[PDB]
Amino acid sequence: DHQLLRYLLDK
Amino acid sequence: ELTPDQQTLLHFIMDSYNKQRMPQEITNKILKEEFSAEENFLILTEMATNHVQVLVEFTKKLPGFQTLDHEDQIALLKGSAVEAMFLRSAEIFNKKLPSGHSDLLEERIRNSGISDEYITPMFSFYKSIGELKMTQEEYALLTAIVILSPDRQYIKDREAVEKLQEPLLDVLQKLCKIHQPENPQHFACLLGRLTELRTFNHHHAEMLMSWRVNDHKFTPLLCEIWDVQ
Ligand SMILES: CC(C)c1onc(-c2c(Cl)cccc2Cl)c1COc1ccc(-c2ccc3c(C(=O)O)c[nH]c3c2)cc1
């Protein structure tokens, strides 16, 4: 869960 | 007063804080778009969802932030998101930042479906924080301190955040005792406002409730960081 944030952190 | 670990720490943070992240094209809508409760809400939603991204990028560039547990990295973001927006908006209103279009931003907030119950406290905060006459340095450090809060709920390894926050707290005090020998209670004032900032988390949850029941939608990004279920 909370995938969008993990995507921004890893961006 | 300003050691070599600190002078370099600060410049990294101000270099981050100054990275003009919010697009002019976007923020320009505050000024140019029609004024109405529906359009006011839409524009504010676009600012917030864009700001969240700006926050993530600024957070990432915080010293030793990426060396943290992944599950704790999220709990800090979800925990500080609102408080960080109140700080940036406050800066807009207090510093009259051109990009913010203060007076029209205020028009939109005051007519976006927010109960007077929250409007009154919200702008009271804005006024008092402005009366602190903070510097951009302070605004930046406070934001960094708020983001790296070990009080956040659901946090696992609290002490590791405290390890990244303490240094920032000290630098801030250094900028209070040094640049403000006039009144050493200045640092305590700042911390006082932080407690006041925390109060808005509850206000914000209720504002979201009201918007939701009135068929207002947010973005996937905001739904996630705010747990709009
Ligand atoms: C989802 C919406 C409707 C919402 O819900 N609660 C609040 C809300 C409110 Cl109404 C008050 C305080 C806090 C929140 Cl979260 C909001 C609006 O949030 C924001 C977020 C961020 C900006 C913001 C940031 C930066 C800049 C900027 C620059 O940096 O150059 C220039 N213009 C800027 C605008 C404004 C409003």
For B224, left (φ over 0), alpha (ψ -120 to 50), or beta?
A: alpha
B141 Cβ closer than 6 Å to some ligand 1 atom:
no
Integer Cα distance of B53 and B23 in angstroms:
11
Per-residue burial over B112-124, b if 16 or more Cβ lie within 10 Å, else e, is: bebeeebbeebee
**Resolution of the experimentally solved model in angstroms:** 2.5
* Experimental method reported for this structure: X-ray
Angle at B34 between CA B32 and CA B38, to 5 degrees: 130
Integer Cα distance of B51 and B99 in angstroms:
13
CB B121, CB B199: distance < 8 Å: yes
Integer Cα distance of B128 and B113 in angstroms:
24
What's the DSSP call for residue B181? Answer: -
Integer Cα distance of B168 and B87 in angstroms:
17
Give me the helices (H) in B4-154, please: 4-17, 24-27, 29-32, 37-60, 70-95, 102-109, 116-130, 136-147
Helices (H) and strands (E) in chain B, counts: 11, 0
Integer Cα distance of B41 and B56 in angstroms:
23
CB B66, CB B60: distance < 8 Å: yes
Rounded to whole angstroms, what are the CA distances from B100 to B60, B140, B226?
A: 24, 16, 23
**Virtual torsion, Cα B147, B113, B124, B84, nearest 10 deg:** 10
Give me ligand 1 centre to Cα B3, in Å.
35
Determine the length of chain A. 11
What's the DSSP call for residue B68? Answer: S
Residue identified by tokens 């007076």 is: B103
CA B75 from chain centre, in angstroms, equals 16
Q: What single letter denotes the amino acid at residue B149?
A: S
Contact residues, chain A, for B224 at CB < 8 Å: 2-5
> What are the residues whose beta carbons fall under 8 Å from the beta carbon of B134, sequence distance 6 or more?
B94, B142, B190
Residue identified by tokens 């600060």 is: B10
CB B73, CB B65: distance < 8 Å: yes
Domains and CATH numbers, chain B: 1-229 (1.10.565.10)
Nearest CA to B13 among B59, B77, B81? B59
CB B120, CB B217: distance < 8 Å: no
Task: Name the interface residues of A facing B (CB cutoff 8 Å).
Answer: 2-6, 8-9
Q: What tokens were used for B143?
A: 């934001």
Determine the length of chain B. 229
Integer Cα distance of B174 and B166 in angstroms:
12
Residue identified by tokens 């203060």 is: B102
Q: What tokens were used for B45?
A: 């939603």
Contact residues, chain B, for A8 at CB < 8 Å: 53, 56-57
Specify the DSSP element, H or E, that contains B165: helix B158-177
